[PDB]
Amino acid sequence: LLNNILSVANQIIYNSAVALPLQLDTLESTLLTAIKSLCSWSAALINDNRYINGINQFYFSIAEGRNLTLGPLLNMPSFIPTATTPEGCTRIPSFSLTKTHWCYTHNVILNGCQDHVSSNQFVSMGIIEPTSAGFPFFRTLKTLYLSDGVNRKSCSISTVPGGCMMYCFVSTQPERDDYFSAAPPEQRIIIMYYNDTIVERIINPPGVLDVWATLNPGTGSGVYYLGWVLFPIYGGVIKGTSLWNNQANKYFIPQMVAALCSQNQATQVQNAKSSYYSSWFGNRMIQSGILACPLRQDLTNECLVLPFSNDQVLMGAEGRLYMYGDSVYYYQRSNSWWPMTMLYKVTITFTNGQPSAISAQNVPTQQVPRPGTGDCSATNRCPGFCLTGVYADAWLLTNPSSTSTFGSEATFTGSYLNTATQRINPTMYIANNTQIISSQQFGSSGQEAAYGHTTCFRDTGSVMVYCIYIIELSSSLLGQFQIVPFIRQVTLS
Amino acid sequence: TDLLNNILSVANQIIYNSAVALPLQLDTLESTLLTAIKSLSAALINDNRYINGINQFYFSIAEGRNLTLGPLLNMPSFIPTATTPEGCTRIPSFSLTKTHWCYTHNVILNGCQDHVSSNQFVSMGIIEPTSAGFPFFRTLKTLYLSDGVNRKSCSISTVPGGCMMYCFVSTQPERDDYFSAAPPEQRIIIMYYNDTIVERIINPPGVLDVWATLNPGTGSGVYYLGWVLFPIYGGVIKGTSLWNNQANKYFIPQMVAALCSQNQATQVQNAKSSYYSSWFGNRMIQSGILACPLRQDLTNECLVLPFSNDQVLMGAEGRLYMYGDSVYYYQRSNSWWPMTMLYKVTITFTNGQPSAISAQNVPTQQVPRPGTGDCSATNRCPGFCLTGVYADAWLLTNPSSTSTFGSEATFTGSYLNTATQRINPTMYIANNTQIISSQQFGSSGQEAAYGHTTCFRDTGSVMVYCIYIIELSSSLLGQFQIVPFIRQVTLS
Amino acid sequence: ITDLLNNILSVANQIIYNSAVALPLQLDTLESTLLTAIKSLQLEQNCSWSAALINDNRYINGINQFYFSIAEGRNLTLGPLLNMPSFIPTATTPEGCTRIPSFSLTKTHWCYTHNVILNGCQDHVSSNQFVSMGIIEPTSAGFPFFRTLKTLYLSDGVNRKSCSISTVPGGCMMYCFVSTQPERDDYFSAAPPEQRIIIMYYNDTIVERIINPPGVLDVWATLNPGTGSGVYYLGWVLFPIYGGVIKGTSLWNNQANKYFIPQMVAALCSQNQATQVQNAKSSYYSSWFGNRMIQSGILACPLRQDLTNECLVLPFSNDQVLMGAEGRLYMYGDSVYYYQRSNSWWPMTMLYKVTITFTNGQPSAISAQNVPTQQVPRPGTGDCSATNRCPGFCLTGVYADAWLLTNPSSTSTFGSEATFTGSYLNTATQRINPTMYIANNTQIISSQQFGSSGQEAAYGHTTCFRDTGSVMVYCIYIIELSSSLLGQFQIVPFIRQVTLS
Amino acid sequence: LNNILSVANQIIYNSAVALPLQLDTLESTLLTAIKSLQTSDKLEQNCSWSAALINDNRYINGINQFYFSIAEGRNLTLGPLLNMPSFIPTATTPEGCTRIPSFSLTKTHWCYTHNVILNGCQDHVSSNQFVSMGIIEPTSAGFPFFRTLKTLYLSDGVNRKSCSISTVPGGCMMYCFVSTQPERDDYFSAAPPEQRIIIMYYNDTIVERIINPPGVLDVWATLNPGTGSGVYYLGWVLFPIYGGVIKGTSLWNNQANKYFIPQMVAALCSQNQATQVQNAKSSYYSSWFGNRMIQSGILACPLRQDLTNECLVLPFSNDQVLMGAEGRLYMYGDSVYYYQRSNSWWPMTMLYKVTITFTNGQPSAISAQNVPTQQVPRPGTGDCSATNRCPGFCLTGVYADAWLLTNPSSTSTFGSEATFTGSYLNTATQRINPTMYIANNTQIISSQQFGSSGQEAAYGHTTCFRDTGSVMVYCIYIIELSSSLLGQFQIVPFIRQVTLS
Ligand SMILES: *[C@@H]1O[C@H](CO)[C@@H](O[C@@H]2O[C@H](CO)[C@@H](O[C@H]3O[C@H](CO)[C@@H](O)[C@H](O)[C@@H]3O)[C@H](O)[C@H]2NC(C)=O)[C@H](O)[C@H]1NC(C)=O
Ligand SMILES: *[C@@H]1O[C@H](CO)[C@@H](O)[C@H](O)[C@H]1NC(C)=O
Ligand SMILES: [Ca+2]
Ligand SMILES: [Ca+2]
Ligand SMILES: [Ca+2]
Ligand SMILES: [Ca+2]
């Protein structure tokens, strides 16, 4: 025996966790495609046939991943609005794409890039349709501008059937002051349907009052998973709470640190433990996690807050959730001591139809660094307390689970700021665990930039993968920043 | 001993997958599917604050003297930019009525000097107030015409339910259009909010064998008494009725005489000759209006109505406007007179069809436009010229309110403030003889091109806002970025 | 060990349970709830179903074919005229005029159209255009009735002229140009007239569009449909065209030096090859019509309801065809054929097999092989009468198409013995004495003049088909006749059998 | 611990075979049902809807009304003939005979029919019957087009004769008898000919029924529809009829000693009053036609697809009406009117208002009030020509109906000044000189003759209606004209304006 059931009961995990959920996923797509072929209708809000089957997947096998190269930039009419004054500040994009449609949002501040009193939030939704030269056009089918005195900040957006769910917090003071007060900022979820119904709810997740000093959405896309909307969150946890106590003495050091940090192992461990706690931000434990909301117009306390185990994950930061086939993935901003791209496979367990636990498996990487200040520049390799960095997510082009060891040879794409400490030199790239294998810098040396959001998808007609690279660029002319959706091909060379 | 622990650890995951993960997946697959099949113009309306503030003269003559430009206001630009360094967006057209707005521009992938192959972007939407009190141009639909047809020089106009765009199809360099005796393909595209699109080749009567070429003027058309009026211009062939009827006619604006010292005979002779171009195939260069009835089955119902050359300068690009019930025309100064040309247009109908047009100039010596050679911003004397740039203007007071038409008129727009170069974009308010308020955008040397200006009133706050759609030379993305600046015209 | 054995059994049993009855059950429940949501989305008392628009079983397999063997072709004669209720409308005043029929019949139905002039034939300004469609059904006497299922009357003040029509599935496609000045002025002026495609369905949808085929503007001074039927072929609608081409264009240059002399002229004209060749070359160029090259061709249109510039113009090579003229397209099985009106120096019936070559799904070239004949002349003026045999420039003639009763391709040499039928005006110079006939390459073997001598007539369109119930071939001869009582000119659908003897 | 392969193989097979097979099958069921909706909406694309069969808005409110006031009636004149594409089909051989039209127009649409005989105008064995239906729409010149939307040709060996037609919602009802022998023989035999009602709907449903109204058999030796239109009235279709009644029957008995002498006859006939009354009584009996009482009447049919004997025969009182003859029924607003052809001694137009009384939802009685007239004669033979004024037995005349332009009820004395229009053969004894006219009780006030002197003609059916859009009244005059070139006859729908000038 022994050897007989092992591979068989392993073939049942494959049968149940990859084979059947793929058949179901594929099933949903062919029926969707079948539905559109049956007063601007909501059935206008469906992507071209060419893309419905090429969204939220790993597009390349491990072998193909070796030969990937960036095509040249393609010109399309940007769906992202710019500022119309020099001091107008458009920042903090969030972008989500499903089989049917996409959602986009960003924050607008009228005068400069700091304002804890008033801002507005632009939202749009639309579809992808092919042009004449074959390449995609992001067709906006609706916009909204939430401008009503509620300072909605750090918003994450996700597609839902029929429209968008956006998750925001309401800013009334400087970020540091949120870490020091005991009560958290107000949390809101806004649902915006293509049929023009808009319902906004102030939400009260259990386990948040008197536990989390502050709580923010991660700014990167949420995802629609099993009838729930999952959003990335982070914040500050108060001392002496159960969550705090349950997280005590936990730390996570990524697989490739040991060979790169010459500091002694015991000191690495003590430094890594100390890295989840910020004296600057009110002596709170800085915590990443997921917020799970059921898709309902009647929301109050049904949303769940689920923290990641600090054994599995770095200090709390902005982030993004993804769906690749049937697995959920999490990008965590590197706001701590490890300056390399952080991607995890997230296992979610439901109990009584509800998410009750999450678990994170890192894709071990030493590639694509991020600028930071002080002792936590792109060159640091050693655990310690750091509170600095920048958002730069990454899209997985190959399946980390395709290798016998998880993520042994992983391939991903995104943008990054190629410098040690400054926010300059935005560079689009494709990378593996150890090396950048394809790269093109945008603009001249010293060109300023900030956050970068990357999303890829396949035209199943031309069998082509495109990636959109949404980058905040410093504008010399109009606006402090111009959020640009670069689009280009990821080609098998 | 130690395979039994992870054989039941695994067999509990198979319980989970079959009893939780998969049935939840099925519940959700059922859920999103039912939603998609559940999906099987009362919105597309401007806010109450603007519906009664559109297409009017906003100020009295007396008030006009105290108008000044307010600071630029920050709204989300509804005009899409390029996403490559060489990407080119050019030739905007913007139209706003009571219920909604329409917008369009031309997109060239490989730089602004490629004149074959392009795409045309279109959007429409409404205006709503923001918490700071100023307007937001809310886009409710976009379209990208990208089928390989080189649609060029497009004008757009709102219609009830949507937009009507007038384009021509360019298949050869401009100059060849004037030389060939067969005119280019003319198209009318109608795009409704309900996502119906109808596009048709039109052939107005009296075009074939009369007009060597014909273009929309790029400025907005207007919807007037059931018809859609677009500006047009082009080249008329020697020996036709239209050429003959137009023979010996010429127009010299009121204010030219005091500024030009040539003998009257020379001015007249030179003015007669400015309507004819040896460079463009010896055609008479001609301005007019295209009148289309609003229908979805257009072939030859659209009418071409030339202006008399006694009333109007050499044919050029232009724009139509509605102020109350009066139609006005802006005519680009592509000839010898470099100042802003605005006219009240009187349209006569015979048996339900526009049969004639007449133009009365608002006499002006203000807001020059850069041009080459002897036809720069400083020229004051009649001659043949084929140079200039588009720079429309919005009348803030009624030229009909004075005893003599246009004796004290006030208008606003952008212009490029140099003699010969297209640099230094400046938003201004002016009267007939002087600029009374002006704000340059960017630094000296900032390159720019066309500018479309449109004003409207917030009847909640009684503030007038103008949008100045300016074509700006860009260093970051694209060779050009078309920007809709917005600011108050303030009474002080 | 007992714990962690008995555990699996009852657990792996629940898995069998989950996978065999529990999960398939949720699948059945799922299927039912959305089949009962798909059906829940969706009138025959009010419907005239388009399978009315179906020819009778007696004709569906008898249309667009060669009906006789070469041997049977020698023994064909015309039967007596048969009386049906004409489907072609006449005038209601003495001065009304109907002219220029076009008629198309395929497997399922027929289409018909003609031009209506209110005040006499001489008025070429303003007219209206009558359109009809229907099917054929047998009568109790055994012969066809052309049953009209819809009429239309295009009457909006637009001067639609020279219209050709073709069936399409579900209806008709008509091709017209718009006339705004006399014919000769169309050749002189450098911009072509407006072209239109009108699609009319049995379901009452009508879309009419102006079209602009590539390579027309600044190349064709004018362009007309040839008035003969177009055909529906491989998803495209082909129409005969003609017009005048401007000097120094690619097309003019590409035709330079080309001419065509039919295979039987040599035995009939007694002039040295040098002059015959030079005169043939010249016959393609009309000084009277603005020094244009007068040119034949085919217009190819995709069947779609949003036409702008997809229609293509393909000229015939002048090495293969005579001077441009009115014409007609045919289908005999899978082969396209072209009849070309003899408006030039050769007065005999001109029929060709057309080879159409495609490229990327679009037609790109046409080749024409003549069926060499010397029979059925047509009346003309001056030196280009019925009796003329020599090359040279002429601009006179009349439309007189002909239907092929046997296959030109069945012989060793193409067209060495062809049999065709039509009508013709049996005089040399006048439009007089309409005569229905059957003829081979050299002789008229069966002929029946209609009316008294001096009876005035004009165009003739002939269409044949077979009753597969009785194995009888019927030909309909649509002839323009001078009228007295009502109208100045009338168009009549004569029908008779073509019988073997 | 060996049984964990018996289950493990059932786990795999369930998740790898059983479930993917089911998910695949389940997918097909959903797509079959989705394509089922794709197919159902594509059926609608194959339909011409009954909604097509509706007159343009300009005419809908302009139908079946008195158009002019009494005073406006004095200033009416005929406009020039207008030219439209005739909806009435002609013959395609010289001997083909089209005769006996019937035409019915209502709010929504019109119905037309006539008889076709293949060889000559005489036949009692075989003929066919053309039928059509359609609408009226305006042209650019402003005047109507009668647009055909469906045509039928009943050709099946049943010799349908003397057909009258009427519109019904969504189509037409036609009434014919079946002719198997000469007319005279019908009057001599006791059993009447076969009577048929055919209903023809736009949706293509056709139901023919042989009918047997009570009170016919052994009472009427023969019975024919009037040929003139019927009308659709309060759910019933009414048809004119006439025929020969048998001696000794209740109807004959109840009609004995009745007669009708029009109000304007005394002043015009010198004969002794006793000699007049005697002849008027005798004028209802034909010794030539099997010694029968020649009777006019009306047949009333419920609108049902399953008719047998629900149809009713209601004769007119011979005190109220002349000898039995062809005729026509009208709706002017809510009033039913009746034209009786003048086949007897009095050669002038006979119009009557008809009152129909209903007994429990069924017509039971009819009465006729004559519009007193001495205008519009009709040709006849011997002592009953257009000039004759004195009672006697005549059996001669021709069908020539009339449309009332003004309301005879709008004067104190019913029809003291009435205005009507039609055509008539303007000669004393012969069928020549067809003339369209407007007349009042005593004089013709407007008149245009058609064709040359001696133009032969026969029946004339006249129908007027109003373009409410332009406020013009138009009258269609359907006249059988002798033809030479093609056909014995050519039935023509002349149209002109009746202008208030
Ligand atoms: C999308 O919205 C359009 C309106 O905003 C709508 O167009 C309207 O469509 C009807 C029929 O197509 C037009 O109808 C006319 O009705 C008859 C037929 O000619 C005449 O009696 C009238 O005089 C008139 O001509 C309307 O004119 C047209 N409205 C406008 C403003 O153009 C489209 O039909 C809509 N598309 C869909 C999917 O329904
Ligand atoms: C809008 O759509 C959602 C589902 O997509 C539905 O639940 C909601 O009630 C809809 N609102 C309206 C007004 O249709
Ligand atoms: Ca706080
Ligand atoms: Ca040209
Ligand atoms: Ca021409
Ligand atoms: Ca009998």
Side-chain angles (χ1 to χ4, degrees), chain B residues 178-260:
Chain B
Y178 287 80
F179 278 86
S180 30
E185 202 180 300
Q186 308 294 312
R187 291 181 186 209
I188 293 286
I189 310 102
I190 309 177
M191 295 155 292
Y192 291 111
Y193 186 75
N194 61 9
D195 235 19
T196 290
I197 304 169
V198 182
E199 174 177 28
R200 278 157 165 282
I201 299 172
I202 58 157
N203 184 49
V207 168
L208 299 178
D209 298 320
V210 175
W211 290 74
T213 199
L214 184 64
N215 285 1
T218 83
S220 57
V222 296
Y223 185 62
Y224 177 77
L225 303 178
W227 290 71
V228 190
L229 317 180
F230 293 102
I232 57 161
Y233 72 113
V236 175
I237 301 173
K238 180 187 190 169
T240 64
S241 306
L242 172 54
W243 170 294
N244 296 339
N245 285 337
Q246 212 66 289
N248 214 46
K249 299 187 179 166
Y250 68 96
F251 183 59
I252 300 175
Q254 284 193 26
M255 303 199 176
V256 178
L259 306 177
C260 179

Side-chain angles (χ1 to χ4, degrees), chain B residues 4 7-8 11-12 14-15 18-19 22-23 26-27 29-30 33-34 37 40 172 180-183 185 187 198-203 208-209 299-300, chain C residues 1 4 7-8 11 14-15 18 23 26-27 30 33-34 37-38 41 158 181 189-194 196 207-212 217-218 308-309:
Chain B
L4 74 93
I7 201 195
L8 174 134
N12 277 325
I14 301 312
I15 278 290
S18 64
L22 285 160
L26 289 168
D27 286 333
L29 183 136
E30 169 180 358
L33 275 183
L34 261 55
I37 86 182
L40 271 52
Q172 56 187 351
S180 30
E185 202 180 300
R187 291 181 186 209
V198 182
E199 174 177 28
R200 278 157 165 282
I201 299 172
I202 58 157
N203 184 49
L208 299 178
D209 298 320
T299 50
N300 73 340
Chain C
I1 250 61
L4 295 128
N7 272 329
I8 281 191
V11 157
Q14 293 171 35
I15 294 169
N18 281 335
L23 244 42
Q26 191 188 12
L27 284 185
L30 181 150
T33 65
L34 53 69
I38 283 178
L41 295 192
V158 174
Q181 51 183 9
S189 64
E194 167 188 329
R196 291 189 180 199
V207 20
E208 171 168 34
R209 279 168 171 265
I210 299 174
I211 53 155
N212 180 30
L217 295 166
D218 298 318
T308 53
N309 51 21

Side-chain angles (χ1 to χ4, degrees), chain C residues 70 263-264 337 369-373 404 406-419 440-441:
Chain C
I70 299 288
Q263 198 167 98
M264 297 197 178
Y337 270 76
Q369 188 180 22
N370 186 53
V371 181
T373 309
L404 286 152
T406 60
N407 193 352
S409 276
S410 293
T411 55
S412 20
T413 305
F414 183 80
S416 60
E417 187 182 353
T419 299
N440 60 27
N441 307 71

Side-chain angles (χ1 to χ4, degrees), chain B residues 362-392:
Chain B
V362 187
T364 261
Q365 63 179 50
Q366 214 41 267
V367 174
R369 112 271 95 135
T372 66
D374 298 323
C375 308
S376 77
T378 62
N379 185 59
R380 301 297 179 260
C381 283
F384 178 79
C385 303
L386 192 53
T387 175
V389 67
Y390 182 105
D392 62 31

